Amino acid sequence: SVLVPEDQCYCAGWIESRGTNGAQTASNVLQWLAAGFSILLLMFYAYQGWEEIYVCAIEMVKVILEFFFEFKNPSMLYLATGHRVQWLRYAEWLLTTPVILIHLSNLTGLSNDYSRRTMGLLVSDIGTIVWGATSAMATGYVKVIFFCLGLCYGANTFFHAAKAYIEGYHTVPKGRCRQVVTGMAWLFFVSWGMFPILFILGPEGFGVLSVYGSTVGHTIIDLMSKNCWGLLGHYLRVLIHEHILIHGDI
Amino acid sequence: SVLVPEDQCYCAGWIESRGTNGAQTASNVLQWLAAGFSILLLMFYAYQGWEEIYVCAIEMVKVILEFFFEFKNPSMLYLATGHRVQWLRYAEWLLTTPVILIHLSNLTGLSNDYSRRTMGLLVSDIGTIVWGATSAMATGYVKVIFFCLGLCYGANTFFHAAKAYIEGYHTVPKGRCRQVVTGMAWLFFVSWGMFPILFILGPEGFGVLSVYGSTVGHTIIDLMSKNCWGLLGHYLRVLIHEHILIHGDI
Numbered sequence A, B: 001s002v003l004v005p006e007d008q009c010y011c012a013g014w015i016e017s018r019g020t021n022g023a024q025t026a027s028n029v030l031q032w033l034a035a036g037f038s039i040l041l042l043m044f045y046a047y048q049g050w051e052e053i054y055v056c057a058i059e060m061v062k063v064i065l066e067f068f069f070e071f072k073n074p075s076m077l078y079l080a081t082g083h084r085v086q087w088l089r090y091a092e093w094l095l096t097t098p099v100i101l102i103h104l105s106n107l108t109g110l111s112n113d114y115s116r117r118t119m120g121l122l123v124s125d126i127g128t129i130v131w132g133a134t135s136a137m138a139t140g141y142v143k144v145i146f147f148c149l150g151l152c153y154g155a156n157t158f159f160h161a162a163k164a165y166i167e168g169y170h171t172v173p174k175g176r177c178r179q180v181v182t183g184m185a186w187l188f189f190v191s192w193g194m195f196p197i198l199f200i201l202g203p204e205g206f207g208v209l210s211v212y213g214s215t216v217g218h219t220i221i222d223l224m225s226k227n228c229w230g231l232l233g234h235y236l237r238v239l240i241h242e243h244i245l246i247h248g249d250i
Helices: A021-047 A050-068 A087-105 A116-137 A142-171 A176-201 A211-243 B021-047 B050-068 B087-105 B116-137 B142-171 B176-201 B211-243
Strands: A002-004 B002-004
Touching: A002 B002, A021 A050, A021 A211, A050 A087, A050 A211, A087 A116, A087 A142, A087 A211, A087 B116, A116 A142, A116 A176, A116 B087, A142 A176, A176 A211, B021 B050, B021 B211, B050 B087, B050 B211, B087 B116, B087 B142, B087 B211, B116 B142, B116 B176, B142 B176, B176 B211
Parallel strands: none
Antiparallel strands: none
16 A cells, blocks of 8 residues: 555556567567658658658657657557557558548549448448557456457448458459559558557557557557658659559559 | 445546436436437438438437437446547437538539548548547547647638539529528538537536536537438428429429
8 A cells, every 4th residue: 555645646557668668679679660651751752742742741740649649648548457559550550541541432533533332441440540559548348348449340440441452452453553553452451450459459448569569569450551641652653653654554 | 535345436426416306207207209300300201312311310220329328338428537428429420420421512413523522521530530539538638639629620610611502592592492401501610519528528528517407408409400301301302403403403
C-alpha cells in the first residue's frame, strides 16, 4: 500500500517498462528514417494528387510527434485500468486509411466518380479502427468482443478492397500496369494485415512485444502501407498517363 | 496525502460529481425516449436505404450502452489527468457522421455516383472528430490547439456541406421538395453546430454543464441530427419518387 500525495494520481501500470534500450534505439532510428523518407517524398511530390501528399504529410507530422511525445498525453492515454493506449496511432489511422482507400477506389485517377463500394469500404474501415481502438481501451473479455467486431468490419474492408483491386486489375492495360497493380495489392494486404497481428503481439493484446517494440514494427508497416504504397499508386497513374499518350483513351 | 493500497489506482478527478439527481433523472428519461423513438423508427424503416437504417441502429445500440455503461470503461475513459473523456460519444460520432454526410451527398438518392466533394466532406468530418476527441483528452493550451484544428476541419465540413445543400436545392423540384431541403439544412447546421457548443460548456471544456447535463443536451441534438434529420432525408427521397411518377425523369 503506497502513499500518494494530494492531487497527483497513481497507477502501478503507468510505471511499467516501455521496452529494452536496444528497442528504444531501434525505434528512434526508424522514427528519423520515417521522417526523412517522408520529407524526400514530400519534396518529390511537391516537385511534380492530394491523396499522396496529404497522407505523406500526416505521416511526417506523426513521427515528429511520436519522437517528442510518444509517451506523453494525449499521444498516449494513461487509463485507470493501468493500461497505456497509444491514441496517437489510432487517431492517425482515422486520418490516413480513408484517403488510402479513396485512392484505392480510383487507382487510375482518370474517372471523377466514386461508386457505392467506396462508401462501404470507408464505413467498414473507420468502424474497424473504432472497434480496434475500443479494444485497446477495453479490459477483460470485452477486449475480445470488440476485437471480433474489428475482425468483422476489417473483413468487410478487405473484402471490398479485394474487389477494388480486381476491378482495378481488369481495367488497367495488360503490361507493367497490371504488374504494378498486383504489387500494390500484395504490399497492401500484407501490411494492412500486419496491424491486427502486431495489435495482438503488443501491449494492447498479449503484450509479447514491448511498447518500443510495437512502435518498431508499426513504423515498418507504416512505411509499407503509406509511403511505399502511395508511391506505387503514383507510379500507376503515371503509367496510365503514359498509355493514354500512346493509344489514347481505351 | 491519501493511502492507496496495492494494485488499485487513484485519481482525485475520477471521483468528481457526475451531476445533480435532477439531471440524472432527466438524462435517463431521455435515454429511454431515444431508445424508444429509434425502435419505432427502425420498425418504420424495416416495414418500408441503409443510410437511415444503419445510423438508427447505431443510435439504438449507443443509448442502450449509455444507459448501462455510460460511466464504465471503455464507454468513459479515466485518464491519469483526472479528466473523464466520454469515448462512447466520439466513437459513435465516427460511425454515424460519415453515413449522414454520404446521405447528404446523395439527397435525392437517384444517382449512383459520388463526387470528389464527398471525399473532402468525409475526410474533413472524420478529422474534426479526431481533433475534437484529442482535445477532450488533451490538457492545457494543447486542448485549445486541437480544438482549433477541430474548428478548421469542422469549417471545411460545414463548407462542403453547405455547397451540398445548395446543389441539392437547385436540383430538386420547386415544391415541397425544396421546402424540405431547407428544413433539413437548418435542422442540420443547428444541431451539428451545437456539438462544439456543448463541448465547450461540458466537462471537456469549461465544464459549465455536468456530465449528466452534457448527456441531456447531447441526446437532444442526437435525435435532431440523427433520427429527425434521417427521417426528413427519407421524406425527401419519397417526394422525389412522387415527382418522377408524375413528370417522369426531369
